Every structure is written in C-alpha cells, then in structure tokens.
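A common beginner's mistake is to predict each chain separately and then try to dock the pieces by hand. The better habit, illustrated here, is to supply every component at once so that their relative placement is modeled jointly.
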Amino acid sequence: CATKPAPDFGGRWKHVNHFDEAPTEIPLYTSYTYQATPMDGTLKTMLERWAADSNMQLSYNLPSDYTLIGPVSAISTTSVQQAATELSAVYAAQGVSVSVSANKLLVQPVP
Amino acid sequence: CATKPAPDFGGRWKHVNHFDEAPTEIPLYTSYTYQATPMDGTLKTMLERWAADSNMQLSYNLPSDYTLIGPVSAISTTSVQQAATELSAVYAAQGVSVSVSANKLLVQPVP
Amino acid sequence: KSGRRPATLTINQGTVLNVYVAKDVDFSAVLPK
Amino acid sequence: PTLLERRILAESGPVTLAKPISNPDGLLVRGTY
Amino acid sequence: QVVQEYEYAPDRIYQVRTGLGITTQVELSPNEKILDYSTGFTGGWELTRRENVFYLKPKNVDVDTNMMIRTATHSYILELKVVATDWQRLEQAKQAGVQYKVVFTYPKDTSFNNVKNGPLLNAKILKDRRYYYDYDYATRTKKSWLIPSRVYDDGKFTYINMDLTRFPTGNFPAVFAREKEHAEDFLVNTTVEGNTLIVHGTYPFLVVRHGDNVVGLRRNKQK
Amino acid sequence: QVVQEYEYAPDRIYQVRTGLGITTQVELSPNEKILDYSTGFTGGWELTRRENVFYLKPKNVDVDTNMMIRTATHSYILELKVVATDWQRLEQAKQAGVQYKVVFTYPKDTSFNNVKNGPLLNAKILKDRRYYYDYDYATRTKKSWLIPSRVYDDGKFTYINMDLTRFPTGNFPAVFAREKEHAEDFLVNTTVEGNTLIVHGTYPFLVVRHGDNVVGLRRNKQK
Amino acid sequence: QVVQEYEYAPDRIYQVRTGLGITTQVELSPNEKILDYSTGFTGGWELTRRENVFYLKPKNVDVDTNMMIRTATHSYILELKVVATDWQRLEQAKQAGVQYKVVFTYPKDTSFNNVKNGPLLNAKILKDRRYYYDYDYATRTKKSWLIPSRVYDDGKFTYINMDLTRFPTGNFPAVFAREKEHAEDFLVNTTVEGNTLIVHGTYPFLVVRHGDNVVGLRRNKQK
Amino acid sequence: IRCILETRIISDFGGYTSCIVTEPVYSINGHNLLLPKGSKMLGQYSAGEPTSHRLQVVWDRVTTPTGLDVTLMGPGIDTLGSSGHPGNYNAHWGNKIASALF
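With all components supplied together, the output reads:
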C-alpha cells in the first residue's frame, strides 16, 4: 500500500570520456550542392531556388510547368553544369532542355 | 516502541598524528605539460589551446579538420618539440605534419 | 488521534510536469535589436 | 508682455514582466539548496 | 537627437536639455518603484510624476541644476540644462538641441554576455540549414483528408504541411507528440502560416487528431 | 571626485562639499535605522531624509558647519562645506569641487581579514587547474539521448556536457547526486551554460533523470 | 487635409494644426486607456478629454508647443501649431490649413505582412473561379417543395438555390452538414441572398430540414 | 512550458517547488528564443486535504541561463493539459490500524 519510488538505473558501467579510433574528417569550407528537395513541387519552383541560391537569373521559356518525378531525386552536385545535364536527361521525353549560358539558366524546348 | 538513537562508532583506535616513512617529494616549480584532454574534440581545437597556453601562433593550413583518436592520449611532455613529433606520428596516415618554427605552430600537409 | 492525520500525495523527483502560462509576458525590452 | 517675458510669467491580477537579473556575481537566488 | 536613448550604467551623469515652453519627459523602467527624488533649485522647475515618468519644464532662463532619482535598485544623476529660450518657431528649438523624450535602456550583466542571423523559424528552405526529409504516416483509412502533404524539419522546428488536401475546408488538426509508438502523448507549442502547421521542436513521433480520426507520424531513424 | 566613496571607520571626520544650487545626497547603509541627527546652524541648510539618504543643500554663502548622524550601531561626523556659490555654468561647480553623491563602504572586521584570480566557475580548461577525466555511465537502454557526452570536474564543480546528443530538442535533465551506488539521492545546486550542465560540488555518484529513464554516473576511484 | 489620418509608428512627431476659434479633436485608439498627458505652455491651450479624444483649442496667437500622450502601450508626440487666427469667414481657415479631426490608424506588425480581388462570396459565376456541379439529393417523398433547385460550390462556399419551388411561401429550411452518410450532423454558418442559401464551407454531406421532412445532399466524389 | 520536477512534492505542509525546463520556448511566431533549454521554474503550493488525487501548484518565476528573471502567472497543468498535477495518493492505513488494533 506504500508509495512507488522513482525509477533506478543499472547496467554495465561503460566509460564516458572515450576516444574513438576513426579520424572522421570534418570539412571546413563547404560549397553549395545542387539537389532536389521534396518541398519545391514543380520544375519551375526548383529552378527558381537554384537561381536564387547561386546568384543567377532564370529564363523559363516553356508554356507549361512540369512536376518533379522519381529520378530527379538523384542529383547532388556542387557544379551547376553537371546538374543541368542530369536534369535534361530526366526530362527528355517532354522536350525540356536546361542549360547555363555562363551567368543564367535557360529553359527552352529541345531543337 | 521507543526512539532509535544516533549511530555509534567502534573500532581499533588507530592514532591520528602519524608520520609516514616515505619522503614524498613535492615539486616547487611546475612547468606546462603538453597533453590531450578529452574535452577538446578535434585536432584544431587542441592546437588552438596549446598555442594559447604557451603564447604561440597557430597557422592551421589544412582544408579540413580531424577528430582526436585513441593513440593521441599518450602525449605528456613539457617540451613543445617532442609533443609535435609524437602528434605527427599518429596522424601520418592522413598526411598531417605538425612542426614548430621556433615561435609558432605549422600544420601543413606532408611533402 | 489517528483520524486527525491527513492523507498525502507525493510526486516523485523526475516526473515531466507542464505549465500553462495564463498572461502575456513581453520580452521586447530585453532582446537585442 | 513680449514672448519671452510671457513664458516666464505663465509658467510661474498581478503584473508580468521580464527584466535582466541584477548583480549575479553576489546573488543567492531563490531556489538554491 | 530629439528622442534620445541612454544606456544605464551605475553612477553616470546623464544630460537632459530642455526648452522654455516645452515639456521634456524622462522615462525610467516600469519594473521598479521610485522611492524619492530631489532637484537643486526647486523653484525653477515645474516637474510632476506619474509612477515612472517625470514631465520637466523650466521656469526661467538660468535654472541649470541637477536632479537625482533613487529607485529600489537604480540611481540616476540627471544634469538639467536650458538650451532654447528665445524661439518663436518650434523648429528653432529642434536646431538648438532640445530633447522631447529621454528613455533609458537597461543591458544585462556582462558575465552573461560571455555566454542573430535572421529569424529562427523560416518556412522556406534556406541555403545554410540542414533538413531531414524522412517521415512516415500511419492511419486506418486509406485515402484520408488528414494525411499531411509534406513533413520535414530544420533541426529545431517540424514543418507539417497540408496544402494539397484541398477539398474539406474544415481540415485543420491538433498536433501532439509522443516518445514511443503507442505511449501516451503530450503537448507541443505550434505556430501556423497559411496551411503549414509548424511544431516547436523535433520529436520521434507526432500525433495528428481531428476527432475520431487520427494520423501518426514517425520520424525514421538516422542510418 | 564627483561621486565619492568613503570607507567607514569609527570617529572619522568626513568632508562633504556642497554647492549653492545643487543637491548633494549622502547615502548611509540600508541595514540600520537612523535614530537621530543634528546639524549646527540649522537655518542655513535645507535637508530632508528618506529612511537612509539626506538631501543637503545650503541657503547662503557662509553656512559651514558639522552634522552628526547616529544610527543604531554607527556614528558619523560630517563636515559640511560650501565650495561653489558664484557659478553660472554647471561645469564650473564640477571644477570647484562639489560632490553630487556621497556613499559609505563598510569593511568587515580585521580579525577576519587574517583568514581572487578570476571566477571560480570557468567552463573552459585553464592552464593552472587540475582536472579528473574518469567517469562512467550506466543505463538500461543501449543508445539513449540521455547519456552525457563528456563528464569531468576541476575539483570544485562537475561539468556534465551534453552537446553531441543533438536530435531531441527536449533532452535536458535534472541532475541529482548520491553517496553510494543504490542509496537514496539528494539535491545539488546547478548552473547551466548552453548545453553544459554544471553541478556545484564533486560527488561519488550523479543521477540524471528525465522521467522514466535514468542514467547513473560513477566517479571512478583514484588509484 | 481637413480630416487627416496618421499611421502610428513609434517615436514619430505628428503635426496638429489648429485655428483660433475652432475645435480640433485628436482621436486615439478605443482599445487602450490613457495614463497621462502633459503639454508645454499649459495656459495657452484649453483641452479636455473624454476617455480617448482630446478637444484642443488655443487661447492666443503664439502658443506653439508640444503635447505628449502616454497610453498603456502607445506613446504619441504631437506638435501643436496655430495656423489660422485672423479669419472672418470659415472657408479662410480651410485654405490656411486647419485640421478639424485627427485620427490614428494602427497597422499590424511587419512580420505578419510577409505572410484582395473583390469579395470572397459572390453568388454569380465568375470568370476565374472553379465550380463543381455534381450533387445528389435523397428524400422520402417524390415531389417535395424542400428539394433544392441547384446546388454547387466555388471551393469555399456551397450555394444552395431554391428559387424554382415557387408555391409554398414558407419553404425556407435550416441547413446542417455531416461527415458521413448516416452520422450525426453539426452546425454551419449560413448567409442568404434572396432565395439562395449560401453555406460557409464545402462538406461531403448537407442536411436540409423543415420539421418532420428532411432532404439529404451528397457531394459526389471526384473521379 | 514543459519542465521536469526537481523537488519531490509531498502535500503535508505546503512549501516551495522547483522544476528545470527541458525544451526551449520560442515566441508567438518563433522568431526569438525566449526561455532557453535549462531554465529553472519556481513555484509554490498550499496545504490541504487531498480529496481529488491531484495537486495544484502556481508557478510564478523563471530564471534563465541567459540572465533573465520573469514573473509569469502559470498554473501547473498535466502533461496533456488537465488542471493540476497528478500524484500518488496514500491514505496511511498501515499506521491507522496498528495504533488502534494493538
């Protein structure tokens, strides 16, 4: 009928201040990785935040907008040219070509 | 049903004011021992507090930072040159060379 | 005499409590500008 | 009178606050054991 | 210049510059009660108080004096001056250098300063924040209007987003949180921006309720 | 010079220098109640009191006198002067040598002085302090968010550090202490700096609780 | 020009221009209580207050001053002027630039502005709104006067229309709503325009009652 | 404000409590950190006969690690929002019987 006390510990007594054996290399100077979040829904809203997060201009010259699909979630590059190449390989069935004219992004149909 | 009193002592009656037989030598002039605490996590934060606790300058010239590993916890020297030698023997697999140019520490890759 | 003793209720020393604030507190004279 | 000579003449439940803590180097605060 | 702020430091001489037909108010802290005050040359200054504010005005051209206010824990030494007395147009007292209002700012102790980049809650995706897009959902009904559209977090706030379940206008839930899968849930602080429900803090489980129908939300474990 | 501190010694003549249109306050101790006071030449000094502070101002050019304050356990002999009387600008009374405020500092007895190097609690590792990095932990769950990252002490404070269990934002415990392993725990005084929980005093065991889950902390014995 | 609105910003100098035989009222917010106020050169301004409004009028030709109002959470610095004093015709004080009324508009905080095209409820069919014409009805009696003529919605309001059941003049129901087909119904907010009953919000089921006779309304599922 | 209790409350005489805050508490819209992670909330309760199996504490001061001293009015609630903190009721029938049986 008495009062149940607080919980009590118990175990192995591992030691806290433990050095490891693998020298994990923490980078100091991290660049910007062009990638595809699930938040930005369509292709236009993803390229509006690649141009904003890199100080470039977006010239979206398509009459309609496409949503993001499965194979878009594999682009992870610190280079804008290699990310625009991997993007245009995905949206090749709809005639979408994305290229960089050295200061801005161009979204035009394929010739 | 009565009241439980205070605890009472009991034992052997050893004597308090006891001289020993080993003349333990207490040092008077203690220098600074270069060693590796568990608190400073990475290699850069350990050398920022060796330079601060010895009035030297740190020139960390690596693009990335390494965490402290197991064999780092054996350096205990009152000499900066013998501690930078034992450190560079540990981080030889990653191309890290630490030396002292007589007034400052240099962290550069190995030639 | 033993009917004059009240009952107790204890709350142990680790239990996660929770506090409902019931009036507004203005921190604007503290936060850096 | 004038303009200068006239101005001489014609004129003759609880509260909830969040303040910074005061002198913490010598404070024995409410709640030490 | 016109409304001047001073920073409170102990035993500092604060200069208050007044004009002849102009009220100047000094405003102390609302926290402490004013014990007493005394100005030299009392018959040359018409000053009244309302619980922390002193409305000062001089009475003659040379009434320069001090005034000392002593509250429960602060002590002020004001240095009263008269700088505009001959003005006809009220812009001339501005240029002479009167002070309409005086307020005191109170810093915290410098031992806590030994212990900023925009707001902490920003519903957009920032350049320099780390996000975690790995969340699940579990519910009885297959296609419900209570299933969130997108759930993620920035390490400090969990951003539940529900702006694609468009049809029922009354579809907005109450979000709880839970430490295990079938433990007892507890309360979180939430702020909302449109259709995004933002939960203050990252949790292992979130529980989303709208009456008899409930949707759980597991954060998957970092592999 | 302007605000002057005096050190209280029994039967010392303290000089208070006033000006003609300037209040000077003397501030006694807040501890003791003022019994009585009497100044010579009463009709040349307008002085009022508010429970420990006397606001002094003269009335004519030659009103030099003494004033004696007698509290319950202290006795003051003030030597009132008039040093600035002809000033037109209030900076001229500063240079003449008036005193806006007078406060008394009260030392302790010199028999206790027969019985400093920075602060006692410093979370960094200092050059000249001895640290003890030998602590264990024991808990039921293998990988918990309640396990401390680093635990050490400087002989006077135990520095529990928890800044690598990054994920749960509500992970901050209540630290107790214990004299044996499975004895009954008691209370400690704690201060915190960021994610470091600092416990006032070194103990054989520390107990870390966050509800139903608990982590013990043994200090290992000095070999 | 004659009735002037100011936007409230903290520590701004608001100019109030008065005339010699003309009341000017300033109108503060009805929400907060006025603590205190003080104008310089009090004997040149006849001003009275009624709980948030100050009726100002000067008394002589050169009474230019400030006035400071301090409420519980706002602080106003008014800059009182005299601009018309010699007028015989009251149109001459209009052209001189007096202000009959002064009112303050209070914006919300700019952190909420980071979070318009006509009215939201428009019973006509607009060019740029999406409508959903797919609704059913179920009732016991075959030809009733309680069956709606046309039911549709614009995504935000459900427009029940009953203007072809012309005969019974007392045919106007009370509309409820329901989440399942035979669940328990609840309450909605309704506004009405003629014979159109407009329900605030889109629901899966609507229930239409006039006593003992009832008509259900299913919204069919989007294929 | 979620806090975890530090002083074991026993409803006999009515005294003073202290709980350590466990989760940081932000603004109304999250732009600022108001109460940091390790603050102490300070409260007090009153003696009474515990008819209901809950205790009623009025928490009325927080002292933050960043050097603040707030004086809010917060009644203590359950972890789901019910008014009053639940406890472990104990009518002492071990001592009431043994003093009058023997």
